[PDB]
């Protein structure tokens, strides 16, 4: 609750070019709610909302993200979990800083990987029909995902 | 080919030698090292001047010049 | 035939290995501690793979860098990194990489990771890229808590004992020592804890059925459809009087709580006690088409000897009891007369007690993957003349000893705990002998 309050702080300062709208529940610092942007297709039409759910034992527990807006993406279960190996067990490091896991969160969603998914069948769908792909998840972001920030 | 020199530090501490090309790309790199010490392109992890060196990129795009010191990290496990 | 050592004697045997080998090597003795537990401790491997080339392929599979060593090339308040708090530098220590941080913070993370799911060996500095491993000293010394110095202690050496033939932990939850013996040879041991275990499988000490046998029972029990029903010996109900029982001593032998009803019965079988042992009469003995019938008989099978021995088990915990309630039938009878050789006669009764109904459960083990025999109803005979002492000497601990004077318990409990291991000991004594006739499987 000491180490929070400077790294929030830190996002507010500097700017995230991939991330706007950091609003949080004040007072509990448990959970925080932001909106990603995404820099390329087909994800790069809409925006997504996440939530991290930070445990009591931060920092020496890694958090939780979960994408509160439904998307079309292979290592993204449908309820919204993620599997990021930078917030696993067995890798978690205390130093990490919040805003060094989002941009780790970025390069899932521009560039996916098939060989360890959530959903084998989109993971089938990117590698052997990328086109189909490209346009499904091009669809589900244009229905679900909401719109982009200005600016 | 003579167009670039560079210096590759291994796990075990020992520095090796290479040669590329300013216009490789990053992925070439990390298939010589496999052919070189045997560790696949995937068990790898390039880092120079702090960040991290992922494939898809060229040399050109990170100010890497001639004679210049390369790290191989490992790879964040089980993901 | 038995040798008990320490979590760090077994440590510094291993250390002192790690020594040798590391100077032929010069690898930090971090380092060293993966590459031979990754070669199971076999240190001619290691070396004939260093001797040979290919060593950036091993730290890689192995998951481990050398650090730059530090060779080459104090009270002002720096911030840390992990906490982002201002303490003095006399606060900071870090390992070979430079990574500074709070000696509060590294507290927090060691013992995180050692306690939560559990990091063997493998802890690295927790700075972000930083792989490099964390030496055994730096825990040491950074932990106060010795539970977890212990428990690291454990999980550190843990490799180095399963790799090695004659070792082999204790089952013990927090005791962290080793049993050494000459040679494997499936016999049980003590673990300076009150700890019998069998050294070849590891489980508790199953005189009657051999090893591999009970390894296949609690497997089939703990997979499917067998970790739901073992609470079921909790409450019964009176076979006469039909009034709600609860079993709260480990003896079978149950009467009703009412004085209308003074009905002796048993608690397995549900039946009159009195004819138990009769000619005619078995509550242990089994002795009972389409394949759906098949395999419905066949589980009820199971669940007539799986009965029996989650029943045994419950009654084995509820006769530990009495150990706490014999020191409470050594002080005054002591007090009275002949000090300190008739206490210890009646601790050596109540030790053959919990060794009958060890043997007892894992007799009906033993008995549920035996083919109906020549030699199996002469077994059956031994375990109903067995399972019949037992709960005759576990019945006399648990009431008939208050009500009786000192002048009687002398002669009344030594003739029963020696006439019940004279049971065991023809039983043991005859599937020994069966054993190596090999008159009876499946
Ligand atoms: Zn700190
Ligand atoms: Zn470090
Ligand atoms: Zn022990
Ligand atoms: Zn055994
Ligand atoms: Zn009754
Ligand atoms: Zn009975």
Known sequence: SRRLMKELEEIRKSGMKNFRNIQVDEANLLTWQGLIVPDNPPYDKGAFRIEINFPAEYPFKPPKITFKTKIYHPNIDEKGQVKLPVISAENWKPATKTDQVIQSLIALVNDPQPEHPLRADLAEEYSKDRKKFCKNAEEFTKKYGEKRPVD | ?79 | RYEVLTAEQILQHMVECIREVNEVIQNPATITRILLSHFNWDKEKLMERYFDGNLEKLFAECHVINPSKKSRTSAQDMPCQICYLNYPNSYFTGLECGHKFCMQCWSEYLTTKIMEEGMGQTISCPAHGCDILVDDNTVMRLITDSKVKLKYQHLITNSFVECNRLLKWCPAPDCHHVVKVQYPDAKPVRCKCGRQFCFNCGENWHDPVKCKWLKKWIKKCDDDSETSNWIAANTKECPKCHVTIEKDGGCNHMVCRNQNCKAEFCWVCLGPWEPHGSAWYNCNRYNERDAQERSRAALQRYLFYCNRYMNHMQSLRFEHKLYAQVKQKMEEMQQHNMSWIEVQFLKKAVDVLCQCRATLMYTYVFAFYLKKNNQSIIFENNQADLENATEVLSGYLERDISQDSLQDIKQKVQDKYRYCESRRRVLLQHVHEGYEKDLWEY
């Open chain 2, 1 to 79: 080919g003579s167009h670039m020199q560079i210096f590759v530090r291994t796990l075990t501490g020992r520095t090796i030698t290479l040669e590329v090309e300013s216009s490789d790309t990053i992925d070439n790199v990390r298939a010589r090292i496999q052919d070189r010490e045997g560790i696949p392109p995937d068990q790898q992890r390039l880092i120079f001047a702090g960040r991290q060196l992922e494939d898809g990129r060229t040399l050109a795009d990170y100010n890497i010049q001639r004679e210049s010191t390369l790290h191989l990290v490992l790879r964040l496990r089980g993901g």
